[PDB]
Amino acid sequence: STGSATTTPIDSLDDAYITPVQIGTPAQTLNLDFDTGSSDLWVFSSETTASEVXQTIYTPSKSTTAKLLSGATWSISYGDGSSSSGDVYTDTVSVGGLTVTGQAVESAKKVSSSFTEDSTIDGLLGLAFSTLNTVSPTQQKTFFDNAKASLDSPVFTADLGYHAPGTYNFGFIDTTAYTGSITYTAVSTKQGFWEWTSTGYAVGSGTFKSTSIDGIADTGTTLLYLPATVVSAYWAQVSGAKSSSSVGGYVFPCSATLPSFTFGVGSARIVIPGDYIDFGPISTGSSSCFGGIQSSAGIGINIFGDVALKAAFVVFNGATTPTLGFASK
Numbered sequence: 001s002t003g004s005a006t007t008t009p010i011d012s013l014d015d016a017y018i019t020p021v022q023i024g025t026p027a028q029t030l031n032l033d034f035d036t037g038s039s040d041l042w043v044f045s046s047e048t049t050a051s052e053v054x055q056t057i058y059t060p061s062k063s064t065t066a067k068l069l070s071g072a073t074w075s076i077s078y079g080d081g082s083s084s085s086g087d088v089y090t091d092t093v094s095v096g097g098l099t100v101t102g103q104a105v106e107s108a109k110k111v112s113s114s115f116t117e118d119s120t121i122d123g124l125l126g127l128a129f130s131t132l133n134t135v136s137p138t139q140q141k142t143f144f145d146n147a148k149a150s151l152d153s154p155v156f157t158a159d160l161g162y163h164a165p166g167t168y169n170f171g172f173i174d175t176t177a178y179t180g181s182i183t184y185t186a187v188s189t190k191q192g193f194w195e196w197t198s199t200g201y202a203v204g205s206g207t208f209k210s211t212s213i214d215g216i217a218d219t220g221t222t223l224l225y226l227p228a229t230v231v232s233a234y235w236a237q238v239s240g241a242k243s244s245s246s247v248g249g250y251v252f253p254c255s256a257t258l259p260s261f262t263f264g265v266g267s268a269r270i271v272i273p274g275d276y277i278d279f280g281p282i283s284t285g286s287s288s289c290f291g292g293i294q295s296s297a298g299i300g301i302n303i304f305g306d307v308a309l310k311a312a313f314v315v316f317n318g319a320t321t322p323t324l325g326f327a328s329k
């Protein structure tokens with residue numbers, strides 16, 4: 001079997017992307033954030049503290065296929081400090097026609113302020129490795145791990161759009177969605193992420209510098225976080241760019257035409273157009289814009305977020321020995 005679902009940006013800045021997910025019987029449709037940087041499928045529910053709900057909720061009592069997973073609890077915290085926790089149910093989950101039975105659906109009893117404030121995201125669907133799942137005492141498999149036995153091929157692809165809809169495919173590689181061929185690179189699962197090593201980078205029409213950049217492919221992170229030295233090299237080519245302490249990163253005149261940024265995948269090169277790096281005005285009407293490439297120094301890990309992934313067709317190969325594939329589009 002296979003599945004195909006349309007993913008849409010939640011706002012005009014491409015801050016995040018949501019994809020419709022059907023849970024339970026009859027189906028209850030919720031818009032989830034597909035996150036390759038985490039491994040929990042959790043949703044706002046009838047169990048969530050009322051004052052913390054503003055979102056479409058999952059009501060397990062209305063689903064004939066829902067089963068409480070006795071004694072199981074979960075608690076997670078993300079890089080930006082947000083958090084949530086609750087109990088667990090198993091239920092039927094479908095994505096773009098791909099149905100999985102007995103999937104663990106983590107019901108939130110509480111959610112942090114950032115979640116309450118974002119009306120567009122009803123929950124998360126983790127697509128990193130199962131070792132990162134927060135359910136205790138026994139960890140639960142991701143949607144992808146549960147579907148592998150049924151998929152035509154143990155793969156899923158991400159085709160994120162630039163201020164436009166995109167697609168998440170499960171089980172097949174749509175050969176009409178990309179140009180040229182796909183270049184695969186080794187993945188390290190030591191930390192539970194889709195971790196890989198980029199072969200280098202280039203700024204604009206300048207030289208490609210061969211240098212190993214270990215990072216993770218994360219659909220759930222907005223920007224492109226790279227080593228401080230690499231980030232400085234990029235902004236040095238933008239005359240009005242400066243590091244702002246108050247805003248939290250590099251900013252530059254919105255009127256500027258930004259150079260492209262190239263990152264290496266083995267012998268292949270993926271080019272991120274300059275416009276993708278223009279994240280948006282710091283505030284509506286401002287002449288100052290926020291940069292899409294920022295330093296990973298305070299994070300501890302390099303992150304190939306949406307800014308980078310949306311410039312390519314990405315293949316997440318979940319075979320026993322996983323690999324990551326990149327192609328231009």
Ligand SMILES: CC(C)(C)S(=O)(=O)N[C@@H](Cc1ccccc1)C(=O)N[C@@H](Cc1c[nH]c[nH+]1)C(=O)N[C@@H](CC1CCCCC1)C(O)(O)C(F)(F)C(=O)NCCN1CCOCC1
Nearest residue numbers: 015016035037038078079080082118132218220221222299
């Ligand atoms: C707007 C911005 C100021 C530039 S942003 O940085 O705030 N916000 C989010 C994206 C977003 C958009 C719209 C609404 C809400 C949230 C940003 O990209 N979040 C990153 C920040 C980050 C990453 N690294 C360092 N800082 C992140 O936490 N991403 C996680 C998914 C997010 C969480 C908030 C809700 C949306 C999904 C993530 O899962 O991808 C992760 F990888 F970064 C991470 O937190 N993974 C947690 C893995 N855990 C570790 C503990 O053991 C279990 C596994």
